[PDB]
Amino acid sequence: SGFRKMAFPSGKVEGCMVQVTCGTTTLNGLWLDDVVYCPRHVICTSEDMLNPNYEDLLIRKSNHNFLVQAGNVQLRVIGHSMQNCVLKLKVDTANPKTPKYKFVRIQPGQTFSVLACYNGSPSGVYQCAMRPNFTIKGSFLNGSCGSVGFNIDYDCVSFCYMHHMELPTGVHAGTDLEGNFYGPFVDRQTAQAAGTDTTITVNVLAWLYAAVINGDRWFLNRFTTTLNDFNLVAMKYNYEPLTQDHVDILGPLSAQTGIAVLDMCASLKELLQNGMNGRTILGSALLEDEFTPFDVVRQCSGVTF
Amino acid sequence: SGFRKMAFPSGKVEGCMVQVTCGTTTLNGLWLDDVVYCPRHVICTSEDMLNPNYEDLLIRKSNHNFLVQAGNVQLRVIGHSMQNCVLKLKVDTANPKTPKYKFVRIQPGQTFSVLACYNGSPSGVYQCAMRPNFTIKGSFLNGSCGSVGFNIDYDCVSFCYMHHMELPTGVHAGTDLEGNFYGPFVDRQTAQAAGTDTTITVNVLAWLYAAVINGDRWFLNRFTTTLNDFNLVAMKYNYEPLTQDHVDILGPLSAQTGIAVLDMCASLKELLQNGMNGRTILGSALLEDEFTPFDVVRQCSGVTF
Ligand SMILES: Cc1cccc(CC(=O)Nc2cncc3ccccc23)c1
Ligand SMILES: Cc1cccc(CC(=O)Nc2cncc3ccccc23)c1
Ligand SMILES: [Cl-]
């Protein structure tokens, strides 16, 4: 029993965290095999960040301008290249602690663990979700650039995020490990406002199923809804549209609890309408949306309570 | 910016997790140097749990009855002993991944990271606090016994918890690494329950300071209170008594924000008597009490390990 916001064990990632320095700028890098992946803005000054020409800033650099530090051992850069907004620094030594890894681009709603790092040194590990507006509600201070997001299913580390910046609203923007930004964001100091955020409906539903598995049934009702009628109500509370793909993805949880997806949809409709009335669902007074259907099956028991 | 429930990087602990098997029972063990620490109930059957004489059950065991597995390598047990409710299995090989460590007994209100494991394999990591009633609100399934709680103090892993059982309310009970249970619990299948829990007042205040640091000031007011008047209000709302030691521990946060401790108490008193009035503090509709003053300073300053 119990339901916690659970992050993957960070050990496989900690062993990849290095410090990258280009002049006055110091951030984090991910050392996998003989390559160090880091944000390309490491080559910029604060003046450069307004309208940077990365190709022009990078052409003025040599391998020895990049200082890479893996703990108290300096790595020697033998090559450099840029792939979108990520700087790939070829080093003279392959990371002996390189785990089995893949680079995955995740979709909004998908969750991951973040190993927050400062000066190539892991500070903490937390869970978060890729918001529908493509930002993440992270916990990051200056020097956290290059900290990564990942999932570890079946002993393999799937890198999905590299932190690049903090937007004016306190939320964070970053890229996949191939340098492609999530969302309409750029690595420039310009008017980039996070678009209006919405609640991840499939996740809230998954968490309601987690609550049923853990014994909470107070929010359930005798009603059902059509998928279309649920959407018309949900969009009014700034909830993401629930699609047929989400209904299918919730199938196993629906079969485990005996509560059909559109019956759990009626519960969410009522919950949005009435609020909690002084009650909590899995220790929360809010409808939690940073647990995916996959996370619920991962964490929760196979036997319903 | 951002404030997440953050656990310590689990890597130093992951390298110590092994699988312990005694007959039909399989749980987790902590392998530090040449000793594997695990719950002593590993030697018991389900009929034994009703009334176990651990010394008598253990005297009937030999070293080879204990199967220890560190990944896909079997460790050979060369000795065994008991220290309170922990089984210390002397093994032939010392853990090469043994980090700098101490065994610390924590007090209620203190938080720690839990590396949940199944079959000696780390599954996830989360942050939790030792409740004033000495239970932990963990997330554990069958097979999680032997999972550990820890904090990192610079380079030193301070082991503070080993998981032993789940109480009828879904909350968890365990011991320090010397086998001494936290709370009035015994390691036996008998009627046991969690005493009425209280809210960790110093931790709620610390999280209000975190909210102020992160830009939330709606709950602040022009008022102050005496420590004694605040304690009358705290006793009414099932909050732990706030002491002069807690007031001193909150000093740095008080100086950083400019909000005196008794000034933040007057904000807490207003939230307890009136509620939040439809608002949230750091994305929560409840007053969060699982962040210590040190956790707030560590996450808002970026300490590394
Ligand atoms: C691409 C880009 C453009 C301009 C400036 C930057 C630096 C940046 O955003 N750094 C930070 C990253 N995360 C959290 C931060 C919190 C406080 C201060 C700085 C933070 C990056
Ligand atoms: C000392 C003791 C007495 C009686 C029973 C036990 C076993 C026990 O409670 N194990 C578990 C621990 N955490 C989560 C569990 C979830 C489901 C089932 C079992 C779980 C221990
Ligand atoms: Cl006994």
Short mmCIF file of N, CA and C and ligand atoms in Angstrom, two decimals, chain A residues 1, chain B residues 41 49 54 140-145 163-166 172 181 186-189 192, ligand 2:
data_model
loop_
_atom_site.label_atom_id
_atom_site.label_comp_id
_atom_site.label_asym_id
_atom_site.label_seq_id
_atom_site.Cartn_x
_atom_site.Cartn_y
_atom_site.Cartn_z
N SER A 1 0.82 -1.21 0.00
CA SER A 1 0.00 0.00 0.00
C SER A 1 0.86 1.26 0.00
N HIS B 41 12.98 -11.24 10.36
CA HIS B 41 11.84 -12.07 10.01
C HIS B 41 12.02 -12.88 8.71
N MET B 49 5.50 -16.28 12.37
CA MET B 49 5.29 -14.86 12.64
C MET B 49 4.33 -14.55 13.75
N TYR B 54 12.95 -15.73 17.88
CA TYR B 54 13.98 -15.53 16.90
C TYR B 54 15.28 -16.26 17.21
N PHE B 140 5.06 0.71 -0.53
CA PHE B 140 5.75 -0.57 -0.51
C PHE B 140 4.78 -1.68 -0.79
N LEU B 141 5.26 -2.67 -1.51
CA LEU B 141 4.50 -3.88 -1.79
C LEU B 141 5.22 -5.06 -1.12
N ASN B 142 4.65 -6.28 -1.22
CA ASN B 142 5.30 -7.47 -0.69
C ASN B 142 6.63 -7.68 -1.42
N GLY B 143 7.66 -7.99 -0.66
CA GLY B 143 9.01 -8.13 -1.21
C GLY B 143 9.88 -6.91 -0.97
N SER B 144 9.30 -5.82 -0.46
CA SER B 144 10.05 -4.60 -0.22
C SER B 144 10.80 -4.61 1.11
N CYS B 145 10.58 -5.61 2.00
CA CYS B 145 11.25 -5.69 3.31
C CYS B 145 12.76 -5.69 3.12
N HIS B 163 13.06 -1.21 6.21
CA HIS B 163 11.66 -1.58 6.17
C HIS B 163 11.39 -2.99 6.69
N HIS B 164 10.41 -3.12 7.58
CA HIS B 164 10.07 -4.41 8.17
C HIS B 164 8.63 -4.83 7.90
N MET B 165 7.66 -3.89 8.03
CA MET B 165 6.26 -4.27 7.88
C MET B 165 5.29 -3.18 7.46
N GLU B 166 4.10 -3.60 7.04
CA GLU B 166 3.04 -2.66 6.72
C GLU B 166 1.92 -2.83 7.75
N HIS B 172 3.78 2.33 7.13
CA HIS B 172 4.91 1.42 7.28
C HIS B 172 5.74 1.57 8.54
N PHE B 181 13.43 -0.87 16.45
CA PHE B 181 12.25 -0.36 15.78
C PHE B 181 12.01 1.11 16.09
N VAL B 186 6.53 -4.22 17.03
CA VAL B 186 7.25 -5.46 17.18
C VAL B 186 7.18 -6.21 15.84
N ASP B 187 8.17 -7.03 15.55
CA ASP B 187 8.21 -7.77 14.29
C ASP B 187 7.55 -9.12 14.41
N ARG B 188 6.23 -9.07 14.47
CA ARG B 188 5.42 -10.25 14.66
C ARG B 188 4.00 -9.99 14.14
N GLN B 189 3.38 -11.03 13.59
CA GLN B 189 2.00 -10.97 13.12
C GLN B 189 1.09 -11.02 14.34
N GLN B 192 -1.48 -4.69 15.73
CA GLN B 192 -0.64 -3.49 15.85
C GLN B 192 -1.26 -2.39 15.02
C1 LIG C 2 7.08 -8.03 10.93
C2 LIG C 2 5.98 -8.51 10.03
C3 LIG C 2 4.82 -9.08 10.55
C4 LIG C 2 3.81 -9.52 9.71
C5 LIG C 2 3.95 -9.39 8.34
C6 LIG C 2 5.09 -8.83 7.79
C7 LIG C 2 5.26 -8.70 6.29
C8 LIG C 2 4.92 -7.31 5.78
O1 LIG C 2 4.20 -6.54 6.42
N1 LIG C 2 5.46 -7.01 4.58
C9 LIG C 2 5.16 -5.92 3.73
C10 LIG C 2 5.85 -4.71 3.74
N2 LIG C 2 5.53 -3.63 3.02
C11 LIG C 2 4.47 -3.72 2.23
C12 LIG C 2 3.67 -4.88 2.10
C13 LIG C 2 2.52 -4.94 1.27
C14 LIG C 2 1.77 -6.08 1.21
C15 LIG C 2 2.11 -7.20 1.96
C16 LIG C 2 3.21 -7.18 2.77
C17 LIG C 2 4.02 -6.02 2.87
C18 LIG C 2 6.09 -8.39 8.65
#
